[PDB]
């Protein structure tokens, strides 16, 4: 394992399971899941979400920025940017390719002109997008959503293509753990 994750980090640094949730910030399917999802982490504290890039080559580059618009953020403030930053994105663009009118994200909270910078410089930031679109294509994922659910005690991990409901995700946990829980 290498360093954890703060700013792409959902609920508790703690929890059991997490799912990393590969998204793409033009994808449809990641504008509705995307927060359906973070309420059921609120409501089950023991799993965690971590968001992990994956720009689909058919959103072009909107969905490549505005991945690096979000972790820029995160740069900026932290957890709180981060995920404030990928709602105003989802709110924003015009998604399916379309991106950002302008490119140009309306956070005034943050230091948009710095914003703009970081996420033309910044490689390191570029990096991080890089590697989780190469872990990805390493696992075999192609579309977005799509969740690697993580046993943290055990290491195990299950991998679920699509909008998951509830159902899908209990019996996921369950496959990877349904023995191991006391």
């Known amino acids: 394992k290498g360093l954890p994750a703060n700013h792409s980090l959902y609920g508790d640094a703690k929890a059991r399971w997490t799912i990393n949730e590969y998204a ?27 968001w992990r890039h994956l720009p689909l080559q058919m959103h072009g580059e909107a969905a490549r920025h505005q ?49 703009e910078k970081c996420a033309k410089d910044n490689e390191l930031i570029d990096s991080d997008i890089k590697l989780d679109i190469d872990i990805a294509r390493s696992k075999g994922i192609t579309a977005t959503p ?20 509830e159902t899908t995700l209990l019996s996921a946990i369950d496959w990877l753990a349904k023995d191991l829980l006391e």
């Not at 995160?74 to 981060?82: T, V």
């Not at 709110?91 to 230091?111: I, M, V």
Request: aromatic fraction near 8%.
């Open 146 to 165: 799509t969740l690697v659910i993580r046993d943290n005690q055990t290491g195990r991990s299950v991998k679920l293509e699509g909008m998951a409901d």
């Open 67 to 115: 991945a690096r618009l979000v972790e820029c953020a995160g740069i900026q403030g932290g957890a709180k940017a981060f995920w404030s930053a990928i709602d105003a994105i989802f709110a924003q663009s015009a998604g399916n390719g379309g991106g950002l009118p302008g490119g140009t994200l309306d956070f005034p909270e943050l230091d948009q002109a710095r914003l």
């Open 24 to 50: 793409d910030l033009e994808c449809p399917f990641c504008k509705v899941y995307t927060p359906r999802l973070k309420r059921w982490v609120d409501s089950h504290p023991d799993v965690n979400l971590v």
